[PDB]
């Protein structure tokens, strides 16, 4: 039963960083949409590559 | 090696001399702005990204 109990908020924890990896996931859908905006693809890519 | 850079005072026609040797090896004279530009886009310029 404690096991359990720690496996539920372990589980809360992942659900957590999992929308805080979304969150920060959204925030390079904006910056790369921004950039590319800026010029297409970051600076096509180059950069990132 | 060398491709033969001039020294000299610049009162010549310079670029009746590069036409003369331009006809001398029938080639196409161009002139360009390379000198005095203090600025890297008419000698490099920098990568297509800006």
Same mark, same amino acid.
């Given at each position: 039963?404690? #096991?359990?109990?720690?496996?539920? #908020? ?14 920060? *996931? *959204? ?12 010029? !297409?693809?970051? !600076? ?6 | 090696?060398? $491709?033969?850079?001039?020294? &000299?005072?610049?009162?010549? &026609? ?6 003369? $040797? ?9 002139? $360009?702005?390379? &000198? ?6 008419? $000698? ?7």
């Amino acid at each position: 039963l404690e #096991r359990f109990e720690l496996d539920k #908020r372990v589980a809360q924890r992942v659900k957590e960083q999992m929308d805080t990896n979304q969150r920060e *996931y *959204y925030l390079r859908e904006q910056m790369k949409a921004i950039q590319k905006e800026l010029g !297409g693809e970051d !600076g096509l890519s180059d950069l990132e590559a | 090696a060398p $491709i033969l850079v001039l020294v &000299g005072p610049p009162g010549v &026609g310079k670029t009746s001399l590069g036409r003369s $040797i331009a006809r001398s090896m029938n080639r196409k004279f161009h002139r $360009i702005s390379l &000198g005095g530009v203090r600025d890297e886009a008419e $000698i490099r310029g920098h990568r297509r990204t800006y």
